[PDB]
RNA sequence: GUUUGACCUCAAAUCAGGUAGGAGUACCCGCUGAACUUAAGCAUAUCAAUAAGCGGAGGAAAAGAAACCAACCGGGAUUGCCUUAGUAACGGCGAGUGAAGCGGCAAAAGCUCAAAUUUGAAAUCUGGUACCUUCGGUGCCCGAGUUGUAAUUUGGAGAGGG
């Protein structure tokens, strides 16, 4: 019996990560926002999908056409860029931060939750970088953050932040102990 | 026969601790003479391979780690001589 | 720069302590600074580097159980 | 503390005793001989002179049967090289061999320390303003 | 940005997180071939500071080289660069960086730029590599590792190799004879 | 009773002759500790503390021609700088020496050492700094070599001789020989006011 | 949902568009690297950091804008020639080897990134298609990119504002 080499390699990697002891800085993920609150966050974030290329192009063409014949505030949108997210973090401008748990280079995201908690900025870990990508008109971003929001959604954002603090931040603060990967 | 079984326990432990490598022989030689006492070896016994769990990992992974987790350190001819004598086991052969 | 120091401290906390750093802090806790400095100046070559490492380990130990 | 000769205060640290620590690259010599070959003293019944200059009589007056037994079945502590304090082989204790084996296959050396200590986040305790 | 944090973290290679990452990646690469393409660089900060860009035309390759030497007089980094340039003949080698190492082998990541791609050609900041004079830079030791091995530097410490040992030896070991003898 | 230790430290630039001088000094003195290098000055006292050492010898050199030496008690003692000019290494074949490594030394001081308080201070410093303790870890019981010190023209001359017998004793010059001047004396170890200056 | 797709990794096309071998080789950049000969026969040594062999480029190549030289009233990229100098210095201090500062002159050009949020809008670009004032330009389309494509800037500092 034989299977493709890459399939065997990835299966071995999975069964090794399941069995290899990792420092608490690793395995800080795998304790993630529950399905309920994750769906609520997606619903809240689904209303602030960044304008896609087609939408921006059509809007600009329409504006130009009106101008050719001869005021609104900044459109609130989710911030996802890792460099931009880490810049909103450490500056206190960020209100809600989402972290993908399935980033290929783990080192790129290990320090993000620690920095977020050090700066006292709410943060949440959500399964699937694709899910963040699906709502940002990209394949994946590995991170998502929120900025100034419409007054209508301010109460929803505050409630979501409180729920996240009650569910994940406070409950899983013990994640520092219990070195992951100890399953027999 | 309780003592008989106990004797075999020490024999198994001794067989798993006897020096069998050139690096081990050099370490034993340095420990015997005053070059590196127990404290010096303990201080030197911390390197890249320390803090690595191996009881739970699969055998096919430990084997890969076994043959790729060694350090080549300066060996000594005097120590290398001792291991050769230890490995030593005739009229017909003569 | 305050930002650089903050980033370095965050990296040190998240990265942790290397096995030689672990032994250094263990000797500081269970022994005196003499053995720690002797080991630091035996792993590290330059004396000032060993002194800086010892000071960093002392600060880490002090901040571990405080605040 | 008292001051220097010219308006400079100086703390008089206690005089440091020139004692030797348990590990200071200096062992219990007890023989006064250096790294010289042990070929000498074979005919004499002593091995050098210890501190203060008195003869170190050779105690390794073993029997032929004992030597032969230790030759075929080498002692677990056998190390080949002889000891400076006597003609008997400087056999290592089982405890030393255990540490040597632990070092030689990437085992733990400084026991009693937990290899999986929780990450005590000292810096995260504070919050920036 | 996150680049500074990654750079700071990478310096602590002995750290537990990086320890586990290296212990996993050493087996992951050993299971793979000696030389294989990498989808993305494992050390984005190091590549970025080395001139690497995410635009089309840049390729990240992983290579394995044996360790040891009855002697050898070239760096394993230069050997890996040459062995990767001898396969991607249509790619120009710019630089490489260490990503991991093993007792028997060392692992290095090399960034490759294709001068044929129009994006590179149209880029004024990278079109300079399209000149044929830069062909097989690794084979001539013109890379960072090659220059370091060659000893090209300034000061008394590199007089014998300030402008190449062979060139200076040839220039100095010449009996100059002018028309009007001095 | 008497117990002492010495720390040997050499700055960058020590030529092979000076390196051999330091090496043979470390062999003549069994209570000596050697260190790799030093860069910059008060740090030297900490190094002695790390080894619980009661003395320190620093071989300064501004250029690689003129050797300099500092003798002091690291904790709080004074320091004296010597501008050594003449120097003969242990690797000279003109002197035949079978001296036992680290054996008890015998000092020889002339009357000039007692002619001034600072002369007495340097005499005592040499006595305890170069005088191996009777119960030193690496010392040897028998006496085979002696040390001779004579000061003339304001500078102290250092000589060493091995002893010999016959079948009522004779001695032959051995070891390094050099001349040391008195440049500067400090109240404290590598610090404090300058008490004496030539 | 005993389901569907997102992804991430890895394959295939005689797939669309491309590139690489090799030859030549006085000079250039590296790897590799001996011996004949010569000194107290030859142990260090000279021949030699050479020939042979191997890989990589052009009309020139390399290097080039200091982790440089100096210790002064400082010099101010690299390269080349004279001097420095057969000097400093090495040399079983025996044969021999042997620079570098500065000074005289041919020429001069300096620079570009990383690391700062565009965040009041990834503003970037590869490729296919229809046209044209076809070494390329415009509209449309697909895709790469947020694990970072646009703009400013980097020790001479620089950036947000009045």
Curated annotation (Swiss-Prot), chain A:
Any one GO CC term of the record: cytosol
Compartments where located: Cytoplasm
Residue ranges of the TM segments: none
Key words of the record: Cytoplasm, Ribonucleoprotein, Ribosomal protein
Domain of life per record: Eukaryota
Gene Ontology molecular function, alphabetical: RNA binding; structural constituent of ribosome
GO BP term (any one): maturation of LSU-rRNA
Family the entry assigns: Belongs to the eukaryotic ribosomal protein eL8 family.
Function field: Component of the ribosome, a large ribonucleoprotein complex responsible for the synthesis of proteins in the cell. The small ribosomal subunit (SSU) binds messenger RNAs (mRNAs) and translates the encoded message by selecting cognate aminoacyl-transfer RNA (tRNA) molecules. The large subunit (LSU) contains the ribosomal catalytic site termed the peptidyl transferase center (PTC), which catalyzes the formation of peptide bonds, thereby polymerizing the amino acids delivered by tRNAs into a polypeptide chain.
Assembly information from the UniProt record: Component of the large ribosomal subunit (LSU). Mature yeast ribosomes consist of a small (40S) and a large (60S) subunit. The 40S small subunit contains 1 molecule of ribosomal RNA (18S rRNA) and 33 different proteins (encoded by 57 genes). The large 60S subunit contains 3 rRNA molecules (25S, 5.8S and 5S rRNA) and 46 different proteins (encoded by 81 genes).
Leftover remarks: Present with 238000 molecules/cell in log phase SD medium.
Name used for this protein in its record: Large ribosomal subunit protein eL8A
The species this protein was found in: Saccharomyces cerevisiae (strain ATCC 204508 / S288c)
Span within the parent record: 50 to 238 of 256
UniProtKB/Swiss-Prot annotation, chain B:
Record's compositionally biased regions (Basic and acidic residues): 4-16
Top-level division of the source organism's lineage: Eukaryota
Locations listed in the record: Nucleus, Nucleolus
Complex formation: Component of the nucleolar and nucleoplasmic pre-60S ribosomal particle. Interacts with the snoRNA-associated proteins NOP1 and NOP58.
Family note: Belongs to the class I-like SAM-binding methyltransferase superfamily. RNA methyltransferase RlmE family. SPB1 subfamily.
Protein function: Required for proper assembly of pre-ribosomal particles during the biogenesis of the 60S ribosomal subunit. Specifically methylates the guanosine in position 2922 of the 25S rRNA at the stage of 27S pre-rRNA maturation. Also methylates the uridine in position 2921 in the absence of methylation of this residue guided by snoRNA snR52 at the stage of 35S pre-rRNA maturation.
Full protein name: 27S pre-rRNA (guanosine(2922)-2'-O)-methyltransferase
Organism: Saccharomyces cerevisiae (strain ATCC 204508 / S288c) (Baker's yeast)
Lineage, uppermost ranks: Eukaryota, Fungi, Dikarya, Ascomycota, Saccharomycotina
Full-sequence range covered: 639 to 736 of 841
From Swiss-Prot, chain C:
Portion of the full sequence shown: 34 to 100 of 100
A single Gene Ontology CC term: cytosol
Protein's job: Component of the ribosome, a large ribonucleoprotein complex responsible for the synthesis of proteins in the cell. The small ribosomal subunit (SSU) binds messenger RNAs (mRNAs) and translates the encoded message by selecting cognate aminoacyl-transfer RNA (tRNA) molecules. The large subunit (LSU) contains the ribosomal catalytic site termed the peptidyl transferase center (PTC), which catalyzes the formation of peptide bonds, thereby polymerizing the amino acids delivered by tRNAs into a polypeptide chain.
The protein's name in its UniProt record: Large ribosomal subunit protein eL36A
Known partners and oligomeric status: Component of the large ribosomal subunit (LSU). Mature yeast ribosomes consist of a small (40S) and a large (60S) subunit. The 40S small subunit contains 1 molecule of ribosomal RNA (18S rRNA) and 33 different proteins (encoded by 57 genes). The large 60S subunit contains 3 rRNA molecules (25S, 5.8S and 5S rRNA) and 46 different proteins (encoded by 81 genes).
Main location (coarse class): cytoplasm
Post-translational modification summary for this protein: N-terminally acetylated by acetyltransferase NatA.
Record-level Gene Ontology MF annotations: RNA binding; structural constituent of ribosome
Keyword Acetylation: yes
Originating species: Saccharomyces cerevisiae (strain ATCC 204508 / S288c)
Gene Ontology biological-process annotations: cytoplasmic translation
Curated annotation (Swiss-Prot), chain D:
Entry superkingdom: Eukaryota
Record localization: Nucleus, Nucleolus; Nucleus, Nucleoplasm
Cross-link (Glycyl lysine isopeptide (Lys-Gly) (interchain with G-Cter in ubiquitin)), chain numbering: 3
Residues with PTM Phosphoserine: 22, 25
Subunit structure of this chain's protein: Component of the NOP7 complex, composed of ERB1, NOP7 and YTM1. The complex is held together by ERB1, which interacts with NOP7 via its N-terminal domain and with YTM1 via a high-affinity interaction between the seven-bladed beta-propeller domains of the 2 proteins. The NOP7 complex associates with the 66S pre-ribosome. Also interacts with NOG1.
Anything else known: Present with 2680 molecules/cell in log phase SD medium.
Purpose: Component of the NOP7 complex, which is required for maturation of the 25S and 5.8S ribosomal RNAs and formation of the 60S ribosome.
Protein family according to the UniProt entry: Belongs to the WD repeat BOP1/ERB1 family.
Protein name: Ribosome biogenesis protein ERB1
Organism: Saccharomyces cerevisiae (strain ATCC 204508 / S288c)
Full protein stretch here: 125 to 253 of 807
């Amino acid at each position: 019996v034989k299977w493709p080499e890459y399939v065997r390699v990835q299966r071995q990697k999975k069964i090794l990560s399941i069995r290899l002891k990792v420092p608490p800085t690793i395995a800080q993920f795998q304790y993630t926002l529950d399905r309920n609150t994750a769906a609520e966050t997606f619903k809240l974030f689904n209303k602030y999908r960044p304008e896609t290329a087609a939408e921006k192009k059509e809007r600009l063409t329409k504006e130009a056409a009106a101008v050719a014949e001869g005021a609104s505030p900044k459109p609130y949108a989710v911030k996802y860029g890792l460099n931009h997210v880490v810049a909103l973090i450490e500056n206190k401008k960020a209100k809600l931060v989402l972290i993908a748990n399935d980033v290929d280079p783990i080192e790129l995201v290990v320090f993000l939750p620690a920095l977020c908690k050090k700066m006292g900025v709410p943060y949440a870990i959500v399964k699937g970088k694709a899910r963040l990508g699906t709502l940002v008109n990209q394949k994946t971003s590995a991170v998502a953050a929120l900025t100034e929001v419409r007054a209508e959604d301010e109460a929803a954002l505050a409630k979501l932040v409180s729920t996240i603090d009650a569910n994940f931040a406070d409950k899983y603060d013990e994640v520092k102990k219990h070195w992951g990967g100890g399953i027999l | 026969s309780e003592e008989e079984k106990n004797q075999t326990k020490k024999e198994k432990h001794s067989r798993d601790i006897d020096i069998a490598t050139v690096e081990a022989m050099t370490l034993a030689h340095q420990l015997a003479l005053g070059q590196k006492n127990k404290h010096d070896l303990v201080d030197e016994g911390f390197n890249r391979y320390t803090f690595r769990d191996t009881e739970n990992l699969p055998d096919w992974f430990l084997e890969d780690e076994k043959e790729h987790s060694k350090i080549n350190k300066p060996i000594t001819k005097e120590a290398a001589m001792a291991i050769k004598e230890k490995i030593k086991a005739p009229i017909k052969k003569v | 720069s305050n930002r650089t120091k903050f980033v370095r401290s965050l990296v040190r906390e998240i990265a942790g302590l290397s096995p030689y750093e672990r032994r250094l802090i263990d000797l500081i806790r269970n022994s005196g600074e003499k053995r720690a400095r002797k080991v630091a100046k035996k792993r590290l070559g330059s004396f000032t580097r060993a002194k800086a490492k010892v000071e960093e380990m002392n600060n880490i130990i002090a901040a571990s159980r405080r605040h | 503390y008292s001051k220097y000769a010219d308006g400079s205060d100086r703390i008089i640290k206690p005089e440091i005793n020139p004692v030797y620590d348990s590990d200071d690259s200096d062992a219990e010599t007890q023989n006064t001989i250096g790294n010289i070959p042990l070929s000498a003293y074979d005919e004499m019944p002593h091995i050098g002179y210890d501190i203060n200059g008195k003869r170190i009589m050779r105690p390794a007056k073993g029997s032929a049967l004992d030597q032969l037994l230790d030759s075929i079945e080498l002692p677990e502590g056998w190390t080949g090289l002889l000891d400076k304090n006597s003609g008997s082989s400087l056999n290592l204790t089982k405890e030393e061999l255990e540490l040597i084996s632990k070092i030689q296959r990437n085992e733990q050396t400084d026991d009693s320390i937990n290899p999986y200590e929780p990450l005590i986040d000292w810096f995260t305790r504070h919050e920036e303003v | 940005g996150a680049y500074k944090y990654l750079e700071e973290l990478q310096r602590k290679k002995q750290s537990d997180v990086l320890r586990f990452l290296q212990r996993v990646r050493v087996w992951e690469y050993r299971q793979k071939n000696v030389i294989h393409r990498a989808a993305r660089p494992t050390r984005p900060d190091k590549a970025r500071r080395l001139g690497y860009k995410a635009k089309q035309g840049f390729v990240i390759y992983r290579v394995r080289v044996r360790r040891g030497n009855l002697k050898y007089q070239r760096s394993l980094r230069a050997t890996a660069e040459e062995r990767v340039g001898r396969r991607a003949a249509n790619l120009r080698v710019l630089n490489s960086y260490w990503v991991n190492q093993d007792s028997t082998y060392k692992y290095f990541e090399v960034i490759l730029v294709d001068p044929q791609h129009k994006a590179i050609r149209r880029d004024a900041r990278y079109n300079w590599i399209c000149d044929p004079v830069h062909k097989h830079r690794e084979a001539r030791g013109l890379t960072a590792t090659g220059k370091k091995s060659r000893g090209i530097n300034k000061g008394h410490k590199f007089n014998n190799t300030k402008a190449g040992r062979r060139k200076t030896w040839k220039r100095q070991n010449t009996l100059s004879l002018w028309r009007y003898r001095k | 009773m008497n117990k002492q230790r010495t720390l040997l430290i050499s700055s960058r630039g020590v030529n092979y002759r000076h390196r051999h001088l330091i090496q043979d000094l470390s062999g003549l003195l069994p209570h000596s500790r050697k260190e790799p290098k030093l860069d910059t000055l008060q740090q030297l006292n900490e190094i002695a503390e790390l080894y619980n050492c009661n003395n320190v010898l620093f071989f300064e050199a501004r250029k690689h021609q003129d050797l300099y030496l500092w003798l002091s008690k690291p904790p709080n003692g004074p320091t004296i700088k010597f501008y050594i000019q003449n120097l003969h290494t242990m690797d000279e074949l003109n002197f035949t020496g079978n001296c036992l490594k680290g054996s008890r030394p015998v000092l020889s001081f002339d009357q000039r050492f007692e002619s001034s308080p600072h002369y007495q201070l340097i005499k005592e410093l040499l006595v305890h700094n170069f005088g191996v303790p009777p119960n030193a870890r690496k010392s040897k019981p028998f006496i085979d070599h002696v040390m001779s010190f004579s000061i003339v023209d304001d500078k102290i001359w250092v000589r060493t001789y091995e002893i010999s017998h016959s079948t009522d004793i004779s001695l032959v010059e051995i070891g390094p020989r050099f001349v040391m001047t008195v440049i500067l004396i400090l109240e404290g170890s590598f610090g404090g006011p300058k008490i004496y200056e030539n």
